[PDB]
Amino acid sequence: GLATILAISTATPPNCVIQADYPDYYFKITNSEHMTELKEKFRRLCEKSMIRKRHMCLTEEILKANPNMCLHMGTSLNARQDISLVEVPKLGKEAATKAIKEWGQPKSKITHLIFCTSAGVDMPGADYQLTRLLGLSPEVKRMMIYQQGCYAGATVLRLAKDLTENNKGSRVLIVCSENTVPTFRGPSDTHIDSLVGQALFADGAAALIVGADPDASIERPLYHIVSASQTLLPDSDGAIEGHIREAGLTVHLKKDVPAFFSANIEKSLVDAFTPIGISDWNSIFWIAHPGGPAILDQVEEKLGLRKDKLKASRHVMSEFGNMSSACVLFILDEMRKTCLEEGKATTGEGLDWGVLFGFGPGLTVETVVLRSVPI
Template identity: 65%
Template sequence: MLTKTRQAMKIAIMDRKRAGLVVAKLQHSLLCSYSMIHKDIRQMSTKNVEEIRKAQRAEGPATILGIGTATPSNCILQADYPDHYFRVTKSEHMIELKEKFMRMCEKSMIKKRYFYLNEAILRENPNMCAHIAPSLDARRDMIMEEVPRLGQEAARKAIQEWGQPISKITHIVFCTLAGMELPGFDYHLIKQLGLDPSVKRVMLYQQGCFAGGTVLRIAKDLAENNRGARVLVVCSEATVALFRGPSQTHLDSLVIQAAFGDGAAAVIVGADPDDTSLERPLFQLVSASQTILPCSDEGSIGHGQVSEVGITFNMSKNVPLITSNNIEKRLEEAFTPLGIKDWNSIFWIAHPGGPAILDHIEAKLGLKEERLRATRQVLSEYGIMISSTVLFIMDEMRKKSMEEGKATAGEGLEWGVLFGFGPGFTVETVVLHSLPINQTATPHDKSTNRLN
């Protein structure tokens, strides 16, 4: 009996071990299955994310698909400006300062400029004619009227040249030095043009003369990271915030009065142009970067501030030298990947900043005179229009290239650079690839009104 009991217990123990092994194997099998399922889910999830990311991005680089510009109707010849300026500011008694200002205007290489401000407006706002007097509210009201008006005019021209329905616009980038409002000028432009309320907006204030490159850099990122995106870029600048009477102790303000003018420029930026809808790209935006130059700070190179008297600037005589001493490094960083070392083999769209800056750049790099022809032409015909200036130069270059029968919109050359210089001292560098003219649009050649 005892033997049978022991045998039964032994059998029970063996059965329990077998059962434990079975359970362990089953658990292992379940764990393996769970691990494989989890791995498959993870792989599927990763694959889905990658597919989504790929589907969201454009295949090709961002391109310029249309350009438009606008200026106020009030045009003043540079030769007449000293008399006009000292008359409207009631400063004709400052004879020596006026003579100094006349020499500044003569050396500026500017023939004429366009302004919103005229004598009638300034008579009604005498505080704006003083060098330092409370006038911010009056300036703000004018800016709120003129900046969006000019921007809208330039935008309509760019859209007309682009030739596509405005329903295809997906993003807006609006830039201006002056004015601040909530919601901003980007919001108002959507309303004025009748764009879809879902259009995504970027509003840039208080940037300065380098920002013509900034807006292209932002638009490039938007276009290349959002498949099918069409970005309306608008730079609209008015000197309303900068205008003030002369001062014996603040000669840097006279530099602004002698050189700056009003103007707006707009471009349409998009990747993967649609051949079926006759989109004709002018330039590809190959790369874009921003840098603060070494050994420069806001106090020594350029510093602006907003106060109850408007925007005041402190400027430095060292800007031309600092710019020319640092520009070749920016070029090397941008063009080494392309194997380009000859700076005369590329076309140039450089923010003018004044003749001294251009002369220093030419001398430092050994540039031929024709390389900065478009830049000097725009400086001559419009003065310095802050962020919009480089887009005016781009427009001038492609028009002249077409008129002269060049092979590309970039003066017949394949590669080019756009430089923006401004406070900080900040430099924007955009590498451009110019496309054959027979693939590009003739300026404003599309008669169909697309603003509906």
């Protein structure tokens, strides 16, 4: 049968930054209060973000201890790696233990592990660290998805679908764990596009169990993964780039990203849903990577979505910020919980069919067709 999501959980670092207070904090800790016009631009970005709070393992204490991270382009990759490479699997384990609990099986039944992060590469990778931290079988079949950015929450579902459907009895643990350690940096009027990241990026981890052929005596499906596609957008090359450099991960925006995603998203919908016979985009539930707020606004306008279609996606953005690959997985967690609390008929806001979108560098759109389960 089809790959099925059997459990979801999440974790965030305990320190959280209130967005209303962030322009003042960020310009203070980076010693940039003299850049008054830049501070005003950053305040506007923070207020436009529709983020209320973000969780960050980067604290004032840590930044004071790593002052090269507070420069715009300080030589700082080593300092960033030293923090992030430990944090990434630690936060991932926090989510994974809880997903395993919901799943209801012993962890010795996990046959496959997908780990996903853009927060720092190491050899061996975070997949190895998580395997040892959790005490998974040494024979777990691992896939380490590094540096794929904000569409990778859909990528891991696409990968998990083929792994679990091609291997009878297989059960995949998926962990996505992201943080701002590689990207945090001081401001510069050269690199205004970096301020976008400073206003949006946040920390979080999400874990899932995916498997085909559920054991109804123990396992409880949440969503079915029907199809998974990936495409590059025409003429979009260079719109979003992220470079791993001596100063950490630097972000570069060169084209109108929301215009590209909104102009092309209907093609992905038609390709995904024509085989199903669906053409009304308000008749399906939506999980859309929300880390670019203007992207969601323009998708909504272009397609004529009702204002509530993206409610769960915008709620996660409001409460957590742009956690990169983890966002869409937080959104699935939020949707099923809200549907249960509100007495909706399915885990997809009472609807049967749904779409999950990852958006990221390429420009790339990942399109996952889901089906809900009854509540």
